[PDB]
Design a binder for this molecule. Structure first.
Ligand SMILES: [Fe+3]
Ligand SMILES: [Fe+3]
Ligand SMILES: [Fe+3]
Lengths: 263, 194
């Protein structure tokens, strides 16, 4: 199991290169569509390790074909220059009737035909195999999502970028057990994990804040299914987007290394 | 233990109310939908006021005297909540009970916030800089450049002053997009989206 960290803001560069030097992470996962006006070589040179791509705002389920295609062609040159270990994106509801959501929506998993056609078009554009992330469900779509992603993957050839903490938000929020994801967990070699928070007015509802250390139920998940997660060529990206404190990240990185020892 | 999904089941049943504070009470307090709407709404509240805290010196600590009437107004005029979001709050402010307390100490943060949001969320490959103009900021503009080097020490949003004077926009605000990271030729202001 390789351990990664997510690079989303240029001000974290020095801290990420330090994590690489000290061998606390083995690769960097970039939120790559934040950087498609950089020279791609310059990012390749800033990390002395393999890189992976995470795409956040393609909005490939709703975006017009012309602007989608241009972004794809630009990402395609980034893939050529950097050879990312994988390329990944989301299944997110961004806009209702022309109005942007600020807290993004879980997709109605009944709408399989629509997602499938859009996913195929976007994977085509990118020219490589695509990994799609699971949503940190609040509402009961959580129970629908495992088989939806399993079917989506077998019909289109996409992969799942299994986000362990999102699945545990889903479990805490909706009851849907993380064991539903067993089959996906044993297939994909690529994972994500992070700390999560709570709704301000209701601590029982979990929110994917990526702002703190991993919870105990999240660590028990990884630890009790460590054989199902770990695999030839398996990777797990730790994600911290807020309270990006070096020391708080270093313990969570070490916690992952304890759960997945090097040999 | 779990909170019931009450009148609904999936997020898709809630889409229409995710940005409407007046319709939140229609869900049971104990229902999960009430909570889900509250999280979406606090996301709107915090995007507005975390980025522009001086707006709370107008509303007061809860932000309500801006948040509620503005959210109702954005639904009425069917605003998109795009990068222009903050600019539209300032527009609403100019016709509100607070219009007498606007000054450049309030104008520049909302201009910086919209320029910042455009350059973080816009994904047009051909647009590299946004230029914002305002009738309350003559001769200067607020420019938002997309990141084009992992090693830039400067802020991505700057106030740039023009040597040749600029036409005041038609509305309170105007904008235009730049294909590279220079500004040559002024193409005319465009009005705010939505
Ligand atoms: Fe993600
Ligand atoms: Fe994730
Ligand atoms: Fe997450």
């Amino acid at each position: 199991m390789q351990i990664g960290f997510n690079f989303t803001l240029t001000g974290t560069l020095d801290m990420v290169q330090q994590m690489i030097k000290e061998r606390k992470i083995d690769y960097v996962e970039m939120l790559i569509d934040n950087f498609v006006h950089l020279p791609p070589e310059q990012i390749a040179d800033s990390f002395d390790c393999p890189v992976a791509f995470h795409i956040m705002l393609s909005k490939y389920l709703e975006r017009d074909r012309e602007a989608l295609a241009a972004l794809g062609k630009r990402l395609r040159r980034f893939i050529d220059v950097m050879r990312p270990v994988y390329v990944s994106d989301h299944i997110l509801y961004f806009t209702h009737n022309g109005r942007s959501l600020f807290h993004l929506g879980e997709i109605d998993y009944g709408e399989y035909d629509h997602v499938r056609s859009k996913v195929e078009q976007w994977q085509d554009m990118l020219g490589t195999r695509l990994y799609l992330e699971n949503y940190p469900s609040i509402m009961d779509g959580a129970w629908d999502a495992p088989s939806f992603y399993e079917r989506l993957s077998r019909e289109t050839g996409v992969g799942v970028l299994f986000d362990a903490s999102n699945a545990i938000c889903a479990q805490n929020n909706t009851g849907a057990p993380v064991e539903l994801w067993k089959k996906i967990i044993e297939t994909t070699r690529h994972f994500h994990v992070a700390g999560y928070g709570t709704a301000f007015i209701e601590p029982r509802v979990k929110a994917d804040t990526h702002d703190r250390e991993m919870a105990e139920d999240t660590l028990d998940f990884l630890s009790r299914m460590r054989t199902s997660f770990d695999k030839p060529g398996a990777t797990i990206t730790y994600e911290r987007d807020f309270d990006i404190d070096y020391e708080s990240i270093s313990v969570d990185l070490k916690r992952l290394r304890d759960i997945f020892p090097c040999v | 233990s779990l909170l019931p999904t009450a009148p609904v089941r999936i997020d898709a049943d809630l889409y229409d109310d995710l940005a409407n504070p007046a319709r939140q009470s229609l869900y049971p307090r104990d229902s999960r939908g009430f909570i889900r709407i509250d999280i979406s709404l606090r996301a709107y509240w915090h995007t507005l006021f975390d980025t522009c805290p001086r707006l709370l010196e107008l509303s007061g600590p809860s932000g309500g005297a801006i948040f509620l009437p503005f959210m109702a107004w954005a639904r009425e005029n069917n605003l998109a909540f795009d990068w222009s979001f903050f600019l539209w709050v300032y527009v609403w402010l100019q016709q509100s009970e607070f219009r007498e307390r606007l000054d450049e100490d309030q104008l520049l943060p909302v201009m910086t916030a919209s320029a910042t949001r455009w350059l973080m969320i816009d994904r047009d490959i051909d647009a590299c800089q946004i230029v914002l103009g305002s009738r309350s900021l003559a001769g200067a503009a607020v420019v938002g450049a997309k990141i084009d080097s992992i090693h830039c020490r400067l802020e991505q949003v700057q106030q740039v002053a023009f040597a040749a004077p600029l036409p005041l926009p038609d509305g309170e605000f105007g904008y235009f997009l730049t294909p590279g990271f220079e500004i040559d030729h002024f193409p005319g202001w465009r009005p705010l989206p939505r």
